[PDB]
Amino acid sequence: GSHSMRYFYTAMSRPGRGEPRFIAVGYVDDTQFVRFDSDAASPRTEPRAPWIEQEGPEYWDRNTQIFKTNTQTYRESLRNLRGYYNQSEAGSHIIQRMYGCDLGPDGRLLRGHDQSAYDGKDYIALNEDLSSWTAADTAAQITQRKWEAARVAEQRAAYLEGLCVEWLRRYLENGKETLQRADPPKTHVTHHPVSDHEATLRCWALGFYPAEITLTWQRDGEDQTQDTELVETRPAGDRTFQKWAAVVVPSGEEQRYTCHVQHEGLPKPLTLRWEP
């Protein structure tokens, strides 16, 4: 199928409690495979998936240097952004970066991504062209100009089109038994009366990978979007995911409602009813 790799960086200042913490995590699709934490007793890049462990010392030290140097630079960046916004030295602030590459089903680069935020709001992003920037405000414009002057976009592009795709493909091959395996949802419908004249129908999807899934209730073939209660897809802790969707229906109209399930791992899309 299609696949992506993303690194997620978080740099958090904490005045009076030491220097800013830097954490980085790496993912292939919905599988985390590495972490680095500057607050660890001995900060180093650590494996978080079995298929990455075969990488040699050279790889681990290469990652660690990258993350150590970034830790320092993000400290500088936090100082700079506090100034760009004329902020006091008293508050805590966060820079986030998420970046990586997407491959289509044939292993080719679909597109690159490189987005940053400050205090949870879009700050600066690399455009799909991998050449130009979008800056959210006049503060971000200062970064844009700095990044233009230093030819930063060319650096990002070369990574996203080169090393990013090459290493993603390596990981996909090495972890093919899991990374390229879609596990379909196990499903069922439960029924719980809420009163004499209403009942809850809950459609369940358990044990699926990847997280992407579509779960909907229909009444008489019409989507019940506004009346459906839909929880966020949640990790089970064994790599798989869970989700449910609930509708409250007139007692006796149960058979007029159908749960539809779309997931990559299903040989066929699913249509379920409550089965008394």
């Binding site: 790496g26 990258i66 630079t73 993000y74 960046s77 970046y99 600066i124 990044w147």
Partner: peptide
């Protein structure tokens, strides 16, 4: 593999 360090100075924001 994350983005490698550049040949020069890593550019801060």
């Amino acid at each position: 593999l994350p983005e490698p360090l550049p040949q020069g100075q890593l550019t801060a924001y």
